[PDB]
Design a protein around this ligand. Structure first.
Ligand SMILES: Nc1nnc(-c2ccccc2O)cc1N1CC[NH2+]CC1
Length: 110
């Protein structure tokens, strides 16, 4: 069984994962797993602390987050990373902005 804190962390995680735009697209999809270092080596020269949602979920399911802010900080790092690597005109950049706002609104509601 999972702790109440794990259940709250999961509610925040699922809110980001499952958010859909007006067309029904989950903006989380590209963030679930980073490209490999072999695939995209220059990402890892620009981004000093890589993060994706696979990492966050396994940490949460390993009962390692002591509170909600610790998870939020990892999401914020991931979205900051996406917006550092990609240009502001790009779709991934814009998706990261929206999901960062979704994250904060979810934390406020909970
Ligand atoms: N351009 C990209 N930027 N960022 C990510 C990315 C993925 C997960 C977590 C954080 C991230 O920043 C992925 C990207 N692409 C995937 C598709 N193939 C081209 C590279």
């Amino acid at each position: 069984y999972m702790t109440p804190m794990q259940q709250k962390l999961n509610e925040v995680y699922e809110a980001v994962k499952n958010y859909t735009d007006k067309r029904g697209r989950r903006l989380s999809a590209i963030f679930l797993r980073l490209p490999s270092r072999s695939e995209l080596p220059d990402y890892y020269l620009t981004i000093k602390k890589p993060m994706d949602m696979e990492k966050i979920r396994s940490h949460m399911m390993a009962n390692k987050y002591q509170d909600i802010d610790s998870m939020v900080e990892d999401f914020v790092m991931m979205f900051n990373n996406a917006c550092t690597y990609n240009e502001p005109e790009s779709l991934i950049y814009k998706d990261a902005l929206v999901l960062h706002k979704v994250l904060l609104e979810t934390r406020r509601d909970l």
